[PDB]
Amino acid sequence: GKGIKKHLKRVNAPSHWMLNKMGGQYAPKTSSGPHKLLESIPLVILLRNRLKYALTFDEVKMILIQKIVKVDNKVRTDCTFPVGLMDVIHITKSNEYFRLLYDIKGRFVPHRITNEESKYKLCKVKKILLRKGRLSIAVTHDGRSIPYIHPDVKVNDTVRLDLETGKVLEHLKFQVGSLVMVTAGHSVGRVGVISSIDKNMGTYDIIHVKDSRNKVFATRLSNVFVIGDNTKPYISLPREKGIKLDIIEERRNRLKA
Amino acid sequence: DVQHERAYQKQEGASFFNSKRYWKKVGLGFATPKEAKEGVYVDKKCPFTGNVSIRGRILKGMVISNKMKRTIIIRRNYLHYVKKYNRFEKRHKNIPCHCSPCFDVKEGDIVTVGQCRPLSKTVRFNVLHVEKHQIFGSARKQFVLF
Amino acid sequence: RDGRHKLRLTGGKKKIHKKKRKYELGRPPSNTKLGSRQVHVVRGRGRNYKYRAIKLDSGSFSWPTFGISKNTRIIDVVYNASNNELVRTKTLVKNCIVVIDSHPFTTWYENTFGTTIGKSKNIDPLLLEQFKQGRVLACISSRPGQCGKADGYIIEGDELLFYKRKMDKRN
RNA sequence: AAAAACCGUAAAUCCUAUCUUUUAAAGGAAGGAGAAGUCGUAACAAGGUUUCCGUAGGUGAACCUGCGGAAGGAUCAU
């Protein structure tokens, strides 16, 4: 037979998963869920190699059976559950909140988040579908179909999502002052306020976005995420602040200590 | 006088008697000809009249044979760079594309072509524009960089 | 069964590899005829149940000019744009011509407007004569082999004239 | 449910036609190599008949002859 494949070779794992060479041959293939396999990461390596909490798949499974892990204030027991691009994960008894963001290196990293900020989550809608009854739903990158969005919300606009009540709060457009962040570009991890949009006739829309340090770089419209307006990032950015310090001067900063 | 086969052509998706011939502009920065606007032709595979949706690759090509009914052969000449010799090489291949009856075509004219769903087993392209170009000799031999 | 072991467009042979898979399938055709309303069900890939009509007698038929549709019964098949033994053996297809009943449409006419929405449309004298004869033609549009029912529309106007002249400078 | 007929997919076997690979093959005609063998002087000097080409014929062999060419000739020259 030639059905759906249910194995992932360790060398075939996505680069940002970061599985070693000698630590086996099979990588934990994320179960079907809300996000892609290539750009999302599973609880196994999130809790084993990123948090360094455990040491063995048996012990990783020993943790999740106790309902001491929560994502979007929702309990998940699926061991190979794709977390998503950015979410709200929560472990109860230690009273801590991790949010998943990007690195200047272009990776997935847990990020310390307070309770009030963890109550705040964002979703980028992928398309709007209107069903019977002239009602509208938007499907987000989170694999969520949120119905009855504001009429002003468009296909590229993003929506503040209140995870507990499961409702939209505030829309964010794609203006020249719309501060965004790169998701799947070769310039992953760079936070920017966009400079201009370069619409092209029927092909992927490449847009130029402007960095804080006055660097302009372009990426497709498909891998942008509006994470706030020009005022400030709505989400607490990681230590690197989303500013791609150049590879040349990274070395002098590491040399000085 | 508009149909002559052993069947009837209905021009599906056109509406007949309510209102307030069908046409479509297929986008891609193109406008339908007045020929297709006010003609009498009926075709289920015309981009401007039929059910075919234009999507995929858009090409420019060199018409080869017109005496074939409702279809034409499109040559596309190009130079193939050879890495070993650092030199180009004249190569080609001809693709068959469906030509709508709403166009006048002659052997020797450039034609703009767009991709559609598989129309025959080897014909999955449709004409959109006829650029008049009048040629001498055999249309096979002349080389155009397009 | 689909999409291989044919000749290349240049005329050359394409010798076969890739021994036949299942997703090509190609189930045998089903010939629907006149008879009781019995059908079978076939299981297509992904657990899709297809309503194979092996013998049909009645279905929905629509008056396009009035925008209506009612259930009536076909009694005979007279022509298809395909080969001739297909209609000679009483088969139904998605562009065949059948003979439809007149009385239920006449009752609809009498109840809606009378006389022997968007009403007052003048209909057609030839269609009225056919209704008086009680034997009016129609063209089946549904796919009996796929959907399992014979949904047709009442043929009218210039197309009716075309389908009539080819039947009767004629034999 | 056994069972039968029909188009349909079609294993496997046989007729003819074609393509591909070895070899049996009696025998034939070669080529190459070894080897103090026999006969002759063919070329190398004007090699004792200048050499050579193409063609044609003869001859035991290298070779001989005719026709038309070449000097890579033995002549750069009344």
Next chain:
RNA sequence: UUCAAAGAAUCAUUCUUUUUAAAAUCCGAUUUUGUUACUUUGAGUAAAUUAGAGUGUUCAAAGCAAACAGUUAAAGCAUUGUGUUUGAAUACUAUAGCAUGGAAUAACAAAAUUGAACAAGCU
């Protein structure tokens, strides 16, 4: 088939900037003016492997780690205790395709057995 001229900065030079016909656009000034090849930049550019960063497996083949004070406590921080810093980047992933700056070099068309633009009037 569009030449050229004028001005700031290193060493005597080199380097940068500005404009100079015609058609539509803005009330003395706001600005686009053939196709392609080619050429510049980008976006998708699987991992392993390749070169390469950082890292003393005894060095190395390695591998992707580890380091830091701590005969046992100090600071950082939390309104008593809680370790911290980190790294796993980079180029490549054709020549084909998408967008893109483009003066040169190349081709293609337009160029008078007649073809135009403007103005007035007519339908």
Next chain:
RNA sequence: AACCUGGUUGAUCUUGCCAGUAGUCAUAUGCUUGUCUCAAAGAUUAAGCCAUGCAAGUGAAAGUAUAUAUAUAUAUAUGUAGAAACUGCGAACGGCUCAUUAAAACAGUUAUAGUCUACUUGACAUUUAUAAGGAUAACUACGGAAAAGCUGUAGCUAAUACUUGCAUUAUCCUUUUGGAUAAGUAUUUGUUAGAAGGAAUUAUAACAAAGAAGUAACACGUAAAGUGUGUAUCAAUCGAGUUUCUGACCUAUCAGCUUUUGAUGUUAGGGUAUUGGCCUAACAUGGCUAUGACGGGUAACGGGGAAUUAGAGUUCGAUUCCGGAGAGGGAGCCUGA
């Protein structure tokens, strides 16, 4: 490290090849071998044949539990477990080999506005009820042969296996509030209108006809109301099938090939999860080709990759991973996403 040396001669300079030289993650083999780390290994030929043993099963809150065993106060209610068996999922993953394969597979780049999509996730639905009907294993009892991962009748029970079936909502008028109007989800047919995309016959709305599969007659117990299992639909998920544009080794002592046996295309129709000569009927004579078609060979799976390199290039790539193929050779089929 962008390198040369010996060999034609009495002697010389050339052309010219032979030999020398070094590398190979490229194989075999001879001699020898005190240590440690590291580890190729029936590819080459026979994708030849296989003795033998193993390689896919599964129950920890949660389907069925009188085979049975044990503990709480007294034949009483709970349990804790549980052989067998019914049911559910998987077994279509993985592992192996490279025969076949020459615009095929593959690779990069496109579309699917021409399709399907299990588990999972998020939203959400339409035309006797203090809970309905059968159909049966294991099991008891008789055996058969030498036997199968074999089996007959008699009798019984279940379940989340199979099968029927228990409101209500929206809209219009005075205008919080009273009346009235109407009730089909996908899917299919005929007639109109029509937030986005690049282009819809789009989403969707209206009219006239059909229209399945459902909306729990199921099991466990968390806040000092919950969960599992299962159901109609939409989207992603994990993918898969078709698909555009470009790229391939040698061979002309293969020049014209394909076309009644579909060849090239139109119409019409069947068939597919969907387009399509995929198939059929009619119609037309077309289509490819020295820019090498059609043939033949490959001791040819393809790719990134390996050796070698100053740069060019040359050769290899069965083999860690990806895509394709096959399970002694063809062909057919159920099951199941």
Next chain:
RNA sequence: AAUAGAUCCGUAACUUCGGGAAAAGGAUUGGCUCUGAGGACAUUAAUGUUAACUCAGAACUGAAACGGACAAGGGGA
């Protein structure tokens, strides 16, 4: 004895290039319901009088069998 007429298809070695050749080797023809197509005569693009035997595919049929008698090569190395 074996076919042997006719139509359609196909036809090797060899060759003096003319042949070999009816090479070899196939299919059909039965029976009927059919159908369709291919000349001379006349009016201001068309419609009326009148004389072929060549093809074709769908049927069904009849005892899966048919140049039905007659007449009429056996081929190949």
